[PDB]
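retry 2 of 3: previous attempt timed out while embedding NAP. Reduced batch size to 1 and resubmitted. Inputs unchanged:
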Amino acid sequence: EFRPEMLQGKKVIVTGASKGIGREMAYHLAKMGAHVVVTARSKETLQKVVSHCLELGAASAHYIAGTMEDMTFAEQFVAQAGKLMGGLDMLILNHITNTSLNLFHDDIHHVRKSMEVNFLSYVVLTVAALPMLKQSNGSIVVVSSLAGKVAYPLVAAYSASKFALDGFFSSIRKEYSVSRVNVSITLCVLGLIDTETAMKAVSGIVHMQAAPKEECALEIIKGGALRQEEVYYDSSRWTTLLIRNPSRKILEELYSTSYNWDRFIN
Amino acid sequence: EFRPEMLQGKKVIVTGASKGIGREMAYHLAKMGAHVVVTARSKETLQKVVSHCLELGAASAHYIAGTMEDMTFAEQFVAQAGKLMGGLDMLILNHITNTSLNLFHDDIHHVRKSMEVNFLSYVVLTVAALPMLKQSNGSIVVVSSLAGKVAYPLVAAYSASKFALDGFFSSIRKEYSVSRVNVSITLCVLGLIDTETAMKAVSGIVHMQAAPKEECALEIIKGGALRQEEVYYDSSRWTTLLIRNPSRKILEELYSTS
Ligand SMILES: NC(=O)c1ccc[n+]([C@@H]2O[C@H](COP(=O)([O-])OP(=O)(O)OC[C@H]3O[C@@H](n4cnc5c(N)ncnc54)[C@H](OP(=O)(O)O)[C@@H]3O)[C@@H](O)[C@H]2O)c1
Ligand SMILES: NC(=O)c1ccc[n+]([C@@H]2O[C@H](COP(=O)([O-])OP(=O)(O)OC[C@H]3O[C@@H](n4cnc5c(N)ncnc54)[C@H](OP(=O)(O)O)[C@@H]3O)[C@@H](O)[C@H]2O)c1
Ligand SMILES: CCCSc1nc(N2CCN(C)CC2)ccc1C(=O)N[C@@H]1[C@@H]2C[C@@H]3C[C@H]1C[C@@](O)(C3)C2
Ligand SMILES: CCCSc1nc(N2CCN(C)CC2)ccc1C(=O)N[C@@H]1[C@@H]2C[C@@H]3C[C@H]1C[C@@](O)(C3)C2
Ligand SMILES: [Cl-]
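retry 2 succeeded.
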């Protein structure tokens, strides 16, 4: 169903693109001849990424460096990126504040910083981007976790932030549908991926089979291109099977059948 | 299983207790002879609530008015509620910021405010209350919604905050299980209730199926008294059947049992 040609000449933002899955998504998109604007705080690393993009065959490639603790920077970044590409077809929200596995004691600072960078900035990014995306019938891809669907210890702040994205973005997806905004929203639920940060964070306590970041990046990109609601990716097929929430879908649907302005009408 | 006598002379905080479901939890707890401290912004209204509590037979009843937009008020409130009662056996976190059913557009401020009042304050209140609760082996009750489990239009900010409640609190519940912290956590997933806020906000055409707030309040108390992880309450038993998510239990235990 998917063809890499689908991304040729397309206009794409990737946040969190200095390393990990973000860097990989930038590279896959370059290979397909996209225009790409990448972002992160290290300008020095971003420069290297931007170079291997050009090398790979990107229609173009630029960076803008900054912290997504700064909502003003979030807004300005999207405008600056849009000017650079003359538009925007896809927005890949991927970055997070640095975290590590710990029991939770009192760190309200960390819960709040997590909610700001991981959640609030995804919203501020979306609001800046939407005019451009509405005109191009674009797509928003929101990168998330198993831990944003199910409960695990040692990541409370991080999980609250990721659960937050599901509720916010899944809700506004219903709104776009009834009010005919033809922008797609794709939520990506990943298991352990073999990025360097993840492998460092985990080398103390139960690793299981991390999955490969290269195929992960491409699965995320396939999802967004195909306008799927959700992408799942994990090294175990049991875990894949059990992530779907069929009865949530039934509940959401019974509501929509009963109350959408367009109940009858197809 | 549940007996009213279980709450007799117990030390309980109830937030958002000036109106709706929380007011009703205050009263039910009063009939059972609990010590209760209530909170919210409406000082005149909270006073009348407290009066009715003594009348109904509360061991004691007091209020402390304030806004849960202010994290430092949140902290101080638990310390004060603790001194008044000597301790805390149960923390019922129930309040929310004002919300209407609207399509989302630009209002980052509303998203932030929802996150602070509906979610961050709950976390600040847990931290302040955890020592007392540790030494009483008590219970934390977090009130949430179907819209904290499933996605509906017209409540984006609100759902973010409730989903966030689930992720944070179900995560630390796992932590207390591993580190043998003997405090229970109960997440309540509510359908439409006949509180005056809901009836103002929701159209006439759905009013039919709003559950009674009195029964809703007693169920919340029962769940936490019995240390149940979740409590479901909705006027349709069909919605209740569908709310459970066995797949998530399994994934959680597939990790936990290693
Ligand atoms: N790796 C996994 O096992 C795993 C599992 C589930 C979900 N995920 C999700 O996948 C996404 C990427 O994970 P990853 O392993 O690729 O992460 P990573 O390699 O550690 O990358 C994090 C990226 O975000 C940037 N960043 C950090 N703080 C920032 C800030 N304040 N403002 C703007 N950018 C900031 C970092 O660059 P700078 O420091 O230079 O700013 C970096 O580019 C995350 O959303 C994560 O939740 C990962
Ligand atoms: N009713 C439903 O259909 C329904 C459905 C699902 C879930 N729920 C849940 O039930 C709980 C209460 O619902 P309800 O219908 O009973 O609500 P409600 O009648 O409007 O009561 C909300 C309470 O929260 C307090 N509050 C509002 N802003 C506050 C602030 N800044 N600081 C401190 N307290 C504040 C209000 O008091 P003041 O104005 O005096 O401050 C009031 O006591 C909520 O968690 C809600 O999510 C209700
Ligand atoms: C112990 C919980 C780790 S969080 C986590 N858990 C998963 N489960 C664990 C149990 N297995 C049965 C399935 C994979 C899957 C994904 C996550 C997960 O999202 N892990 C990430 C978190 C925590 C640290 C590692 C990752 C990168 C990060 O920056 C640091 C953010
Ligand atoms: C349109 C969605 C409204 S949010 C909501 N939806 C539910 N669905 C509706 C359809 N039913 C078949 C199943 C339950 C159930 C509960 C909620 C729900 O949580 N409603 C509350 C929200 C929205 C307004 C009413 C409540 C109080 C509030 O302050 C104003 C905040
Ligand atoms: Cl990496």
